[PDB]
A and B are shown apart, each in its own frame.
With several copies, the nearest count.
Chain A
């Protein structure tokens, strides 16, 4: 009944800002402490959060993202069939003009990156890496990296032909953060498959290989 009431408060999109902040804070508080309530009421909560991400009020969005971060951090398994949507919405939230929202979105992206099934994440992210606008592609590459850190050698190896084009073309991007992100992602691949990576990088210039090798040696120590 308490959950239903909080849920009823949260259904008022773009209105009752203070009361809904209170409701969200209460949601987070309860999330920190029942465990079996989610089995019946999770999905509605998720849906409402994702709707509230589109709010006119920035702070409501940021708070919503912090809440999503907590829910992800406590009970990840229930996101299994909703990963692609969640990723997309979060990455979208990275394009917000308000800095606090982007920050909370980056935190949420980190935990999401440590929660979601890795294969599907990569598979979803590839066209996003290739086609999304700055800085969505940036957050997507970062997340892809954090995912690569959790994959097996065999699986990564099998997924490489799909992963690589985005990283190679992305390395030629004009935005410093993107190039840096691609270098780091390559470093993370190298951490897993080692020398086997080298034939995939035949299309890079010597300068870029220098830059990559430096960060590899840096990552080793």
Chain B
């Protein structure tokens, strides 16, 4: 009466097969999920790179402009300082001369 035993072995193996199928399906689902995740993080990388890129370019433009303003303004400042010095020396000379005439 080993026929029944063989029948049962068949049953066990069939059950195991079905279970393995379910498991494989789950693993494939996990692969798909990981793939979708890769796609998403890829999209984020693209947008991050793009945004940071344009922003940085803009900032570089404004920075260099502000540098130009600093140079020009400081040059004007130095020249104004020279005019001031000359005028002060004129005051000083005239005042001395006045003191001389008064005496």
For chain B residues 14-30, which have a beta carbon within 8 Å of chain A?
none
Q: Does B100 touch A at the CB level, under 8 Å?
A: yes
Instruction: Name A107's closest neighbour in chain B (CB-CB).
Output: B82
- Chain A at the B interface: SS class: helix
Chain A residues whose C-beta falls within 8 Å of the C-beta of B85 in the assembled complex: 99, 103
Chain A nearest CB, measured from B95 CB (Å): 9
Q: Are A100 and B82 in contact (CB under 8 A)?
A: yes
Chain B nearest CB, measured from A70 CB (Å): 13
B-binding segment of A122-130, A152-160, A192-200, A207-215: A207-215
The 0/1 profile, CB within 8 Å of B marked 1, for residues 96-110 of chain A is 000110010000000
Q: Are A177 and B100 in contact (CB under 8 A)?
A: no
Q: Are A177 and B93 in contact (CB under 8 A)?
A: yes
A-B contact count (CB 8 A): 27
Contact residue among A100, A176, A211 (Cβ-Cβ distance under 8 Å from B78)? A100
Q: Are A180 and B78 in contact (CB under 8 A)?
A: no
A99-B82, A100-B82, A103-B85 known; A211 vs B93 contact (CB < 8 Å): no
A100-B78, A100-B82, A103-B85 known; A180 vs B93 contact (CB < 8 Å): yes
Chain A residues whose C-beta falls within 8 Å of the C-beta of B100 in the assembled complex: 176, 179, 211
A74 to B10, CA, bound (A): 99
Chain B residues whose C-beta falls within 8 Å of the C-beta of A177 in the assembled complex: 93
Q: Does B58 touch A at the CB level, under 8 Å?
A: no
Q: Does B103 touch A at the CB level, under 8 Å?
A: yes
The 0/1 profile, CB within 8 Å of A marked 1, for residues 82-103 of chain B is 1001100000110011011001
Q: Which 9 A-B pairs have the closest CB atoms?
A: A180-B96, A210-B103, A207-B103, A211-B103, A99-B82, A176-B93, A214-B99, A211-B100, A176-B97
User: Taking beta carbons and an 8 Å cutoff, which residues of B are in contact with A?
Assistant: 78, 82, 85-86, 92-93, 96-97, 99-100, 103
